[PDB]
Paper text:
Curli proteins are produced via dedicated and tightly regulated cellular processes, and their fibrils mediate host cell adhesion and invasion, lead to immune system activation, and scaffold bacterial communities known as biofilms. The two key players in curli fibril formation are CsgA and CsgB, the major and minor curli subunits, respectively. CsgA, a 151-residue protein, consists of five imperfect sequence repeats (R1-R5), defined by regularly spaced serine (Ser), glutamine (Gln) and asparagine (Asn) residues. The first and the last repeats (R1 and R5) form amyloid fibrils in isolation and are critical to CsgA seeding and nucleation by CsgB, while the other repeats (R2-R4) contain 'gatekeeper' residues that temper the amyloidogenicity of CsgA.
However, while 45LNIYQY50 (R1), 47IYQYGG52 (R1), and 137VTQVGF142 (R5) formed unbranched and elongated amyloid-like fibrils, the 129TASNSS134 (R4-R5 loop) segment formed scarce and more amorphous structures. The 45LNIYQY50 (R1), 47IYQYGG52 (R1), and 137VTQVGF142 (R5) segments bound the amyloid indicator dye ThT and demonstrated dose-dependent amyloid fibrillation curves with short lag times. 45LNIYQY50 and 47IYQYGG52, which are overlapping segments from the R1 repeat, adopted very similar structures. Both segments, as well as 137VTQVGF142 (R5), adopted a classical amyloid steric zipper architecture, with two possible dry interfaces between paired β-sheets. The β-strands were oriented parallel to each other along the β-sheets. These three structures are class 1 steric zippers, as defined by Sawaya and Eisenberg according to the organization of the β-strands and β-sheets. In each of these dry interfaces, the chemical properties governing fibril stability, i.e., buried surface area and shape complementarity between sheets, resembled those of eukaryotic steric zipper structures. Specifically, the R1 45LNIYQY50 and 47IYQYGG52 segments and the R5 137VTQVGF142 segment formed fibrils that bound the amyloid indicator dye ThT and formed canonical amyloid class 1 steric zippers. These segments contain Gln49 or Gln139 (marked in bold in 45LNIYQY50, 47IYQYGG52, and 137VTQVGF142), which are critical for fibrillation and cannot be mutated to asparagine without interfering with curli assembly. The R1 segment 47IYQYGG52 and the control segment 129TASNSS134 showed a milder effect on the fibrillation rate of Aβ1–40.
Residue numbers in the entry:
A (entry chain B), B (entry chain B), C (entry chain B), D (entry chain B), E (entry chain B), F (entry chain B), ...: 1 to 6
Write the structure that this text describes.
Amino acid sequence: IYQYGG
Amino acid sequence: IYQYGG
Amino acid sequence: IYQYGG
Amino acid sequence: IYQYGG
Amino acid sequence: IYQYGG
Amino acid sequence: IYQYGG
Amino acid sequence: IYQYGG
Amino acid sequence: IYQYGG
Amino acid sequence: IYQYGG
Amino acid sequence: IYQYGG
Amino acid sequence: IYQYGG
Amino acid sequence: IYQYGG
Amino acid sequence: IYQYGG
Amino acid sequence: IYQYGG
Amino acid sequence: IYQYGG
Amino acid sequence: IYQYGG
Amino acid sequence: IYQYGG
Amino acid sequence: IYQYGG
């Protein structure tokens, strides 16, 4: 699981 | 799962 | 699952 | 599953 | 499944 | 399934 | 299934 | 199935 | 799990 | 220009 | 320009 | 320019 | 420019 | 420029 | 510039 | 510039 | 500049 | 500059 926000 | 937002 | 938003 | 929005 | 919107 | 919108 | 709209 | 609209 | 915000 | 092959 | 191969 | 291969 | 391979 | 390979 | 490989 | 490999 | 490898 | 390896 890889999550990137911004 | 790969999630990218922005 | 690959998700890209922006 | 590949999803791209933007 | 490949989905592209934009 | 391949879907392209835009 | 291939769908293209736009 | 191939569908193209636009 | 990898999460990046900012 | 729209090109589809396959 | 839209190109789809495969 | 939109290119999809595969 | 949008390129997708695979 | 958006590039996705894999 | 957005590049994803893998 | 956003680069992801792996 | 954002770089992720692995 | 953000770099992540591993």
